Structure formats: structure tokens, C-alpha cells
Amino acid sequence: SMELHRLLRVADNQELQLSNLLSRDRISPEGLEKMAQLRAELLQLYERCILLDIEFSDNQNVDQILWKNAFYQVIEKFRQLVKDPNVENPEQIRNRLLELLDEGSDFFDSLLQKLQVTYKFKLEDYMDGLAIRLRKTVKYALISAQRCMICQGDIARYREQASDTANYGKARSWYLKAQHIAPKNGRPYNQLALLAVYTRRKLDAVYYYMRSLAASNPILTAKESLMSLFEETKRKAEQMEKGLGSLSPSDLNKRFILSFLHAHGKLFTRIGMETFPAVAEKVLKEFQVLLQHSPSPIGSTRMLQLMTINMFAVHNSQRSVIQEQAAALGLAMFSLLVRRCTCLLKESLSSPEDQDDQDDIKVSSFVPDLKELLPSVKVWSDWMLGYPDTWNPPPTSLDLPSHVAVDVWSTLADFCNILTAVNQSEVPLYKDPDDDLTLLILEEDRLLSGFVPLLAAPQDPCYVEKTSDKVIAADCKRVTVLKYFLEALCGQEEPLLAFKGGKYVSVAPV
């Protein structure tokens, strides 16, 4: 304990010297030598601490301080010198920056191995949060390891920029591996959002910044980042403002993403909401057409990002008009998804009471266009069970300029009706583990792991035989979840759906 405090005591004084050296407008070749000397002592000091007592280190923020003092400060000073016209040999300074980055990459590669050796674990045994199984020291060593991976990403990104290139592929891989370690940390999403802005992937950038805000450890800076992004979107939408079934999938898609971001800008910035109803109708109209294209121009992964942003807007909205309008938009897009899923199902039937078991729709017969949409339908339905008071009673604040409404509850009743003819028993699902069984995790639940709003929906483990087809198994689980969802809505106190006169129907208000 006293040895640790002794180590940090030395470090702070080392840092005081480094900070002062860096304050200078220029750094002599003698100044650069001393800096190298200071950084090396710093690293040895910090690393010893980490490898002596990881929990102490975490509590003293040694990782954060290591990065800030020995790397961030220095890197940023170098970037400034290279651009200073007062600097006579900028290319030589660039070269020292590259060198420092490469030595940086080695340092963190080495520290990652040491963490594993010192605290006795392999990283690959902890990359699946959804694995049901932590020693207090391994908990903290994983936390630190995640920080090392974020540092590797930042180093890789710095390297690209120092080289006037933009192959951000390595940086992204480091951030993705960091997110896997601990999905509740907002920082990996924030850094991934930055990569998206560099590459002008606007929707991904908004998605990831929102992930960063809706994490257990949020990155508040993401707020300002989004304001700036949405300001830029507002401009581009207003600029593009100076039939749908005729456009190509690609053109319609590009148009849709812009409308969608425009609507969410208004919701996020709370500016220009007086014309939210018109942008919302535009979003829904375009979304409705994109759903009819085969294969989906949008795709499951993007669809899930859309659902995520919709859920975020509903929570970020606090029951105000704005919160009702966010919920209305989400519910409407959810409804159009379900409707399309219904068409798809019945493209593959008698009346409910008259359904014969030999005519049931087998899950293994699901067409690929249906399979692409079900993960998003399931995740939104999870969200709804999590926040029943946002949609029951239904929001009433959104009135589209055409006054044509989307009937969520009738659409859900129809879905319930076609679903009764679906047989999901091809792969039996079990509540309890067994030697012949194994854990079924859905790809969409993995993706959204860490998203705080979804922490309120059930997480009940699900087991299937090791011999079962895992694709069919996953869809049988989705169908079971949606059937339970629809049952839950029928069993609600003041229910919006009911089985009535031989079929499921809407009993929601006019």
C-alpha cells in the first residue's frame, strides 16, 4: 500500500516536469530527449502499479492518467508542431510522432499480455457477455484491458491522420473488441461514432453516439457531438428541399435515411418541431415503400439501428408532446414492419378456429425477406413490454398532414391471427440447462447488449438441443417471444387487443 502510494508520488512529480516541458512553444532536440526519459519512467511507474494492485490502480484512475500524461498530451503537442509554420523541420516531427505511436502500440500490446499473465486469465474467455457463468481482480483487469484496447484504437486512428491516410479499419477493430469486453462502457461507442463521422457514415455516427449516451457509463460529450451532427443534417435536408415506387432502391434508401435523421434531429435538438408531422409522414411513406423491395435495401442490421434510435428518442424525450411524438413515430414504424411480416407469412390458410395442424406454417419455411425483419420486430416488442405506459393508452399527439393514420393495434391483431397458424415446435425450447442442451442467444440481443432502455425486458435463458438447426432454433425463439408478447397485450389491465368473436381484433380507442 505504502509502496503503491510511493510509486504514484514519484509519478506526479515526473508529470509536473513533463507538463512544463510541453508548455513551451518549441521543443529543442535536448527537450525531446528529456521528454522521452520522462515518459519512460512514467510508464514503468504506472505499469508497476497496475500489475501490483489492479483494484487500487482502478480506484486511482491509473489507466486514465497513464493515457492522458504519457500519450494524449504528447501526441496532441506533436500534431500542433507539425502544423506550426514556426517549425523548420515539420516532416522530422511527423516522423517522431509516428515512432511514438508505434512504441505506444507495443506498450499496450505488452501490457495486455501482462494483465493476463499477472492476473491469470485469457481475454477470449470473456468476450461473450451473454455467456452465463467473477473474481474481483479479474473484473478490474478486464476493465483495464478494455481501456488498453480503446488506447490501441486511438493510437491507430492517430497514426492514420499522421500519415495523411484514412484506413480506419484497424482502429475500428480495436474499438469493437473493446466493446465486446464490457458493452456497458459508453466509450467504445463514442470512438466508433468518431470513425463514422470521419468516413461520413451519418446514420452509424448518430446510432453510436446514442449508444454512448444510453450506456451505464455514458459519454456526455456525445450530446454536443449529436447537436453538431443534427445541425448538419438539418442543413442538408433543407438544401435537398430545393412516385416513390418509381425510384430505385438505392435512391429511395438515401432519401429515407436523410428524412429519418431529420425527424430525429428535431426530436433531439427540440428545434423545428412544428414541422415534425410533415417529416414524420415523409419517413413513414418512404419506409413503407422500402419494406416492399426484395431483398431489403435496408437489411436487418440497419433496421436494428433504426429501432435503437427510435427507442432512444422516446427515453431522451423526458408526458410531453415530444415524448408522445417520439413514441408515435416508433410505434408507426413498428407497425409497418409487422404489416410487412404479416403479408410475408400469408404469402406462405384457413380461419383461426378452423386451422388444421397439418396446415400450420412451419418456421423452417420462413422466406428470407421475413427472416430479415423479425429480429427488429422482436426487439421493439421487448422494448414495449419494458415501458407499457408509453403506448398504453396510445399516444395521440401525432397527426400527419394527410390525416391518414397508421393503425398499430389492428395491424397487431392481424399479426396475432396469422401467427396462430405458425408452428414453432420444430425446435423445442427449454427453460433449464442439460448435458444435451446448449444456450440459445439471438444475434439481435447480442448487438443491443449494453443499451440501458432494454435492461427492463425479460432475459430468461433459453436452451436447445446441440443437434438442432440453430438458424431455425433462433426463429422458433423469436416466434415464441412474439406470441408471448401478443398474449401479454391481451392480458393487460386495460388491453388494446382482445380475442373477440372468433379472432383477435383491436379494442383500442377510435
Q: Which amino acid is at 70?
A: A
Q: Alpha-carbon distance 332 to 179, whole Å?
A: 31
Examine the domain organization and report whether 319 and 370 are in the same domain.
yes
Nearest CA to 143 out of 65, 213, 58 is that of 58
DSSP 3-state of 101:
helix
Model resolution, angstroms = 2.1
- Integer angstrom CA distances of residue 499 from 335, 403, 478, 489, 495: 19, 29, 22, 11, 11
* Whether the Cβ atoms of residue 281 and residue 332 lie closer than 8 Å to each other: no
Examine the domain organization and report whether 289 and 225 are in the same domain.
no
Q: Which three cell numbers stand for residue 44?
A: 514503468
Examine the domain organization and report whether 233 and 257 are in the same domain.
no
* Whether the Cβ atoms of residue 291 and residue 411 lie closer than 8 Å to each other: no
Q: Alpha-carbon distance 332 to 329, whole Å?
A: 5
Q: Which amino acid is at 226?
A: L
* Whether the Cβ atoms of residue 190 and residue 212 lie closer than 8 Å to each other: yes
List the chain gaps (C–N > 2.5 A) by preceding residue. Answer: 133, 242, 318, 348
Angle formed at CA 74 by CA 53 and CA 15, multiple of 5 degrees: 50
Q: 394, exposed or middle or buried, with CB in 10 Å at 0-12, 13-18, 19+?
A: middle
| Residue that is written with C-alpha cell 473493446 in the block | 178
Nearest CA to 497 out of 483, 482, 486, 485 is that of 486
Examine the domain organization and report whether 250 and 233 are in the same domain.
no
Q: Alpha-carbon distance 153 to 174, whole Å?
A: 5
Structure-determination approach: X-ray
Nearest CA to 74 out of 31, 136, 117 is that of 31
| Residue that is written with C-alpha cell 516522423 in the block | 95
Examine the domain organization and report whether 347 and 467 are in the same domain.
yes
Element at 498 (helix H, strand E): strand 497-500
Nearest CA to 488 out of 349, 374, 392 is that of 392
Provide the domain limits for residue 91: 1-242
Q: Alpha-carbon distance 440 to 464, whole Å?
A: 6
Q: Alpha-carbon distance 101 to 89, whole Å?
A: 19
Q: Which three cell numbers stand for residue 392?
A: 398504453
- Integer angstrom CA distances of residue 481 from 361, 376, 449: 17, 12, 17
DSSP per position, 46-81:
HHHHHHH-HHHHHHTTHHHHHIIIIIIHHHHHHHHH
What is the total residue count of the chain? Answer: 510
DSSP 3-state of 146:
helix
Nearest CA to 57 out of 176, 145, 150, 154 is that of 145
Q: Which three cell numbers stand for residue 461?
A: 435463458
* Whether the Cβ atoms of residue 441 and residue 130 lie closer than 8 Å to each other: yes
- Integer angstrom CA distances of residue 191 from 35, 181, 202, 222, 372: 28, 15, 14, 10, 28
* Whether the Cβ atoms of residue 381 and residue 482 lie closer than 8 Å to each other: yes
Q: End of a domain among 242, 265, 289?
A: 242
Bridge partners of residue 96, in order along the sequence = none
Q: Alpha-carbon distance 18 to 10, whole Å?
A: 13
| Residue that is written with C-alpha cell 388491453 in the block | 495
DSSP per position, 257-297:
HHHHHHHHHHHHH--SGGGHHHHHHHHHHHHHHHHHSSS-S
Report the domain count for the chain.
2
Q: Which three cell numbers stand for residue 245?
A: 415506387
Q: Is the C-alpha dihedral spanning 269, 318, 216, 377 positive or negative?
A: negative
Examine the domain organization and report whether 118 and 251 are in the same domain.
no
Question: Treating both helix axes as pointing N-terminal to C-terminal, what angle do 202-213 and 300-315 enclose, rounded to 10 degrees?
Answer: 50
DSSP per position, 456-479:
GS-----EEETTS-HHHHHHHHHH
Examine the domain organization and report whether 236 and 279 are in the same domain.
no
Residue partners of 278: CB distance under 8 A and separation at least 6:
401
* Whether the Cβ atoms of residue 280 and residue 293 lie closer than 8 Å to each other: no
| Residue that is written with C-alpha cell 413515430 in the block | 329
Bridge partners of residue 500, in order along the sequence = 503
Element at 329 (helix H, strand E): helix 321-347
Q: End of a domain among 223, 242, 261?
A: 242
Residue partners of 386: CB distance under 8 A and separation at least 6:
453, 454, 456, 457
Q: Alpha-carbon distance 448 to 226, whole Å?
A: 20
Q: What is the 3-state secondary structure (H, E, C) of 382-430?
A: HHHHHCHHHCCCCCCCCCCCCCCCCCHHHHHHHHHHHHCCEECCCCCCE
Examine the domain organization and report whether 261 and 237 are in the same domain.
no
Examine the domain organization and report whether 249 and 235 are in the same domain.
no
Q: Is the C-alpha dihedral spanning 181, 183, 187, 190 positive or negative?
A: positive
Conformational region of residue 272, where left means phi above 0, alpha means psi within -120 to 50, and beta covers everything else: left
Examine the domain organization and report whether 181 and 128 are in the same domain.
yes
Q: How many helices (H) and strands (E) does the chain have?
A: 20, 6
Q: Which amino acid is at 123?
A: L
Q: End of a domain among 242, 262, 291?
A: 242
Q: Alpha-carbon distance 313 to 265, whole Å?
A: 10
* Whether the Cβ atoms of residue 389 and residue 492 lie closer than 8 Å to each other: no
Examine the domain organization and report whether 301 and 214 are in the same domain.
no
Q: Alpha-carbon distance 460 to 477, whole Å?
A: 12
Examine the domain organization and report whether 167 and 288 are in the same domain.
no
